[PDB]
Amino acid sequence: HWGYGKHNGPEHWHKDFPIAKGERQSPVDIDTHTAKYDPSLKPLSVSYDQATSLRILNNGHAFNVEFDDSQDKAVLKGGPLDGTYRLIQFHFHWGSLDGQGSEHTVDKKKYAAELHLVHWNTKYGDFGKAVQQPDGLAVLGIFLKVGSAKPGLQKVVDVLDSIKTKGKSADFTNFDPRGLLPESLDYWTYPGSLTTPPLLECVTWIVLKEPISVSSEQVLKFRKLNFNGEGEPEELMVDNWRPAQPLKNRQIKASFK
């Protein structure tokens, strides 16, 4: 099945998922000089005070922190979005080395990692119905650079031991996603897709300009995770990022002057 290696990696995905070569694939390179300030964007609103985390899961491609989305509790709205999008999970993509790991790039610059906070449009009732819609999802992307530690990331780093291999999960309640946000909400936005199979073209991407810093010791622990399941030959979970895809018929809008 699909993965990030030579034989089942991004260059292979089109075979099972032909939309891989579609008209609004992600990630993309953000050319900061071609992105246009858009004065028609409303301010962005990230309301995570009632967020309720439940569980953390190694799914063999990354780890997901999953949230209880059965009620109106952690929402994204405003910016390019119409209506209300509810947080369902976050995950990261990262590299084998600090020079690579983000999926989006900014003037061809690769960050050490990228955080994806995934939300579904509440007019569609649930996540499964939302991913059949062109405006079903909104993903808030945040770059990570290696420098100072992020304190609000450490509870996630400390639980990674317990989810080393594919299919392991642990209880992960009362995690506050606010502690993963940079100061500025300046962002670029464009229409795109999931960056993993099934690569559905259902996503409004909101990529923040300001990266958060995490420590080398924090990102080192992400790299100790495994793609394989327990008792299998060890393949470190590293380089689980898809490269930049053709922009095609799309414009990237900036929220800031």
Ligand X SMILES: Cc1occc(=S)c1O
Beta strands in 202-249 (DSSP E): 203-208, 212-214
d(CA 143, CA 11): 24
Binding window for ligand X (CB under 6 A); candidates: 12-20, 42-50, 189-197, 224-232: 189-197
Among 77, 86, 116, 209, indicate the residue that binds ligand X (CB under 6 A).
116
Q: Cβ atoms within 10 A of the Cβ of 148, count?
A: 11
116 forms part of the interface with Zn ion (CB under 5 A): yes
Q: Which does 139 bind (CB under 5 to 8 A by kind): Zn ion, ligand X, none?
A: ligand X
d(CA 20, CA 24): 9
Ramachandran region of residue 56, left (φ > 0), alpha (ψ -120 to 50) or beta? beta
Q: Cβ atoms within 10 A of the Cβ of 33, count?
A: 6
196 forms part of the interface with ligand X (CB under 6 A): yes
Is 61 among the catalytic positions? yes
**Distance in Å, CB of 115 to Zn ion, minimum:** 8
In terms of CB distance, is 160 or 200 closer to ligand X? 200
d(CA 189, CA 187): 7
Ramachandran region of residue 76, left (φ > 0), alpha (ψ -120 to 50) or beta? beta
Q: Which does 194 bind (CB under 5 to 8 A by kind): ligand X, Zn ion, none?
A: ligand X
SS3 annotation, 11-45:
CCCCCCCHHHHCCCCCCCEECCCCCEECCCCCCEE
Binding window for ligand X (CB under 6 A); candidates: 13-21, 161-169, 184-192, 193-201: 193-201
168 forms part of the interface with Zn ion (CB under 5 A): no
In terms of CB distance, is 27 or 211 closer to ligand X? 27
Look at residues 51, 83, 66, 46 and name the one whose alpha carbon lies nearest to residue 159: 66
Among 44, 194, 199, 206, indicate the residue that binds ligand X (CB under 6 A).
194
93 is in an annotated binding site: yes
Among 74, 115, 139, 219, indicate the residue that binds ligand X (CB under 6 A).
139
Annotated binding residues for Zn(2+), as ranges? Answer: 91, 93, 116
Annotated binding residues for substrate, as ranges? Answer: 195-196
Binding site for ligand X (CB under 6 A): 116, 118, 139, 194-196
